[PDB]
Design a protein around this nucleic acid. Sequence first.
RNA 1: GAGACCACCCGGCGCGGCGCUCCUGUACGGCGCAGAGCCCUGCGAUCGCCUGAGGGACGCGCCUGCAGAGCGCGG
RNA 2: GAAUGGACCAACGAGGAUCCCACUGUCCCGAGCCGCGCCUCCGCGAGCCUCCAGCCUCGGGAACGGGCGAGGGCCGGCCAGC
RNA 3: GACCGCAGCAGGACUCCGGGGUCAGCAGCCUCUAGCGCGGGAGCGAACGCGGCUCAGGGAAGUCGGCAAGCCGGCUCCGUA
RNA 4: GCAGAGGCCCCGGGGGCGAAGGCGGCGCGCAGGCCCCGCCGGACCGGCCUCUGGUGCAGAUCUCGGCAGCAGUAGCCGCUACUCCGCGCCCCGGAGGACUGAGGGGGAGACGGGUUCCGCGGCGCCUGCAUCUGGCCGCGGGUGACUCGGGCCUAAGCGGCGG
RNA 5: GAGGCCCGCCGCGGUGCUGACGCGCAGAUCGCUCGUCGGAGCCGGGCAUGGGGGCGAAAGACUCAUCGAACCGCCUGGUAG
RNA 6: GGACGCCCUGCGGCCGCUCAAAAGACCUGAACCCGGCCGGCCGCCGGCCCGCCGGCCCCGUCUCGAAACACGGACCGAGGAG
Lengths: 153, 88, 69, 50, 97
Amino acid sequence: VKYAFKSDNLLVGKSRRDGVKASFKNTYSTCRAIKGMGVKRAFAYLDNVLNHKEIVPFFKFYKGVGRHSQARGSGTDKGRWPEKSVVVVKDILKQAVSNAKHAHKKEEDELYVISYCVNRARGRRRRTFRAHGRISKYESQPCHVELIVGPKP
Amino acid sequence: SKGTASFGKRHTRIHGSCRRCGKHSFHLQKHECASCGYPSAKMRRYNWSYKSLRRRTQGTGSMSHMRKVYRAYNSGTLKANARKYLAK
Amino acid sequence: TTQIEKNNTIVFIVDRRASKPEIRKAFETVFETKVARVNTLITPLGLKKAFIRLAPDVQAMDVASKMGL
Amino acid sequence: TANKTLSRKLRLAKKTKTNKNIPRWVIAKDHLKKTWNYKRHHWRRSHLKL
Amino acid sequence: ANLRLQKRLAADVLKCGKRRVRFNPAHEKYIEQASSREAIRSLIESKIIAKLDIKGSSRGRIRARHAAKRLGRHSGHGKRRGTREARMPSKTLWIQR
RNA sequence: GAGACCACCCGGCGCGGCGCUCCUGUACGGCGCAGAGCCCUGCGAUCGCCUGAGGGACGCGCCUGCAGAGCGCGG
RNA sequence: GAAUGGACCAACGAGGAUCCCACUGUCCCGAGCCGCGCCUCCGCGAGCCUCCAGCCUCGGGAACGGGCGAGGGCCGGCCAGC
RNA sequence: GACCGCAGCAGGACUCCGGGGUCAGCAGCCUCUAGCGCGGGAGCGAACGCGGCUCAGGGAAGUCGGCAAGCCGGCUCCGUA
RNA sequence: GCAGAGGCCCCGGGGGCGAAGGCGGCGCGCAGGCCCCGCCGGACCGGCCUCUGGUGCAGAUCUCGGCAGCAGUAGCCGCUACUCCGCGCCCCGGAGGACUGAGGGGGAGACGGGUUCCGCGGCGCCUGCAUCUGGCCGCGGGUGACUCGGGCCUAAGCGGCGG
RNA sequence: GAGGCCCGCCGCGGUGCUGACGCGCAGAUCGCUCGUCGGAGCCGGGCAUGGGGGCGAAAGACUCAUCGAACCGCCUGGUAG
RNA sequence: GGACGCCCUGCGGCCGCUCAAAAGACCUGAACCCGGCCGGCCGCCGGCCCGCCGGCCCCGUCUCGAAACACGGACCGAGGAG
């Protein structure tokens, strides 16, 4: 059982990726901001963060993240534009958008993102080298992105 | 310059492969094997290390001849022995 | 194979123990040919490789053809 | 090192030919499940004869 | 399209350093297909592969100041940064005399 | 005019021109019977004139040119 | 206090003192200006520590409390400094 | 540029060949040949740091102490207790 | 209460008509603890009597394994440096602008490493950002001597000798 | 043209800054500033000296990140009011 | 040891398939820790409909005496001593 969301006859399109090589913290925020958006609006919004026109609000992991003007509306002064995460979240959304529309024969407007669970995953552990004969670590933080488009909220 | 610089002036081969024991234990300057004991006829066995003795001894190799002759003693090597003792 | 055509040389892996003269007699007796000089390198992987330049009268291309090289 | 010894060269040579991966057909024949040699060395980290 | 292997071969053929070697950018394909000293040599005849000159520094300013120095133009006590004995050893003049 | 980020204050901005004013100190080049002298009409560090010149500007005044006020997001 | 060496200083000395001429932000008394870090972004990403919890005043207490008695303050969430 | 220090460790590794100009110089400073663009980039131009400059008038009054910085300097010629 | 041993479990104890184990919820017991239910799980497990012990853990700067907050934080500040265009990656080609500056970030050897060299293909790792790059990975190859060096001879030294 | 002469490059040392760094570039590095630089000089290879022993222009220094007695195994799961 | 079809520039995703089961790189899969969705405003003990009143210092340990500005203790699992 890999998929957290239980549809129980909700006519949804679900696409996921496992151990995507991005930061868990940055991807989590991109998915949370996307939640509730129209599928088309989400595509435009994610293109805008890549173009720096719109910011991704950092509602959870915000310490050390800079306040910007673009995040004034979202209710959090803090925000960041995560480019690598945006590519992955758009790609995962694209597979869900196609899968719901092919499987449930639903027009793109009806589909809206409804669920966003992202779980931290096991990562590589490259060693770092420090002073006084110390060997440290540069462990990665991959995540399992699961994004589900759906009929209505 | 006690550590790194001192380790950087190392480019020599104190130890070399042993003739008898094939290990990097043969001192090139002293001409003796740290583990093998070569050029001594007797081999270096010290009961201070149980583990060192276990790392190289009988049973740590093919034991070719001994195995073949031990097997024969549970077969016809003993009959050959009896024939020799009596006449030939 | 280009060497067989312009240097008259067939390159053969031979036993490491074999000396230059021994490979001269062996190549001559096994391939029924006349040899001029054998240069030998021990491959980094411990194999003696021989470069036998055949005597001018014989052509290596024919000798190679008999072997199949 | 360019001035090496045949006896030293011979022992170093075996190491070069021995540092090889498990033949894929061997993995299939014995059903290995552990396809990594673990006795494979690398010139950057491993010090042979040390 | 790494043309590095072609560049290294071209340097030995031309008998010059890789920096001097220049390639006609138009013939990218025929250089990519090149893979041998001989193939590069055919390209050298077509003039697609060429070397530049050593572009050594000019000596014109130097050979003008040297000529003016023969007229005693740039020799003065401010110009001298070394002792007379260094500039003219006294042993040298006595041995000559 | 305000600033680490933000916020603040202001907005069809700005770009680059033109005048004004200012900074430095008389632009390249051309001209001379300048020029110590040397030597052939050649050479020459320099000096005077065209020149308080030219070059520069983030301050002002103006448009003379391009432009410039999101059915972008939210209520 | 006299080869447990005494006295003695030419010449030396990254040796230890004192003063003068010179010189200077050492200072009066600080000011402006470069580069690079910092800060913000993109991509990477540890260490160390960690009973819990992290506002004060006084009192009592292993006599110097974050917690205990009595007051007096305090949405919560962060940044740059310190 | 691969050795040795746990590293793709401003760490340490012995030789050989050594151009031009300014110079007393194999010094410093630029260059020919030859190599080459190094554990990444963008912005902003806060404090504070880290290196670097300058500072009116005074000048060590600063400090445990002139620490640090500044002065001086090349060459020629006088003049040297 | 644990884990084994000897017995018993009135037609011969409980089990694929679901064992042990795990997760939540009752019930009983002063409590140590027990029991049952639902769900997962997938083959073993007990109650009483007698016997045995390597028999119950909040600590020991405990051992080992996992992993949190700090924290998207500290940091990636040596070697003057890149730019445009090509299809363009930090690779490559042209064009610029630099740099190491002949006690070289040059070209070579002794040593030490031991194939790293080369060509072709690729990126799964590694290249502490990236990569289409590479010293990385797969495959296939590569070190030719009468004159150079070893060998040779002796040096400091070291062994060997009737004993 | 003499000198265990002087200045000074590389080298060889390491004085200050009490500088940088101090979870370091680094279990000793880096920057200037230095001491020396024909000598009692420096450097590479071979060799010799071995643990209460060596070696020491002496500092109980040095003997492989250990030294007022190395390191590895063992006695040893030494003993502790 | 993964039929097919759907798409995807492609990756990969999606369905499903095989099998009793995905058991899918592996039996069971606890604690710590974390992400979604939902539900509250919250340490313990007592009374009550349940967020209000009342009471509560951090254990272990030496110690005459510890909440101590004494010491050990981030967290959890397994092992751990008459």
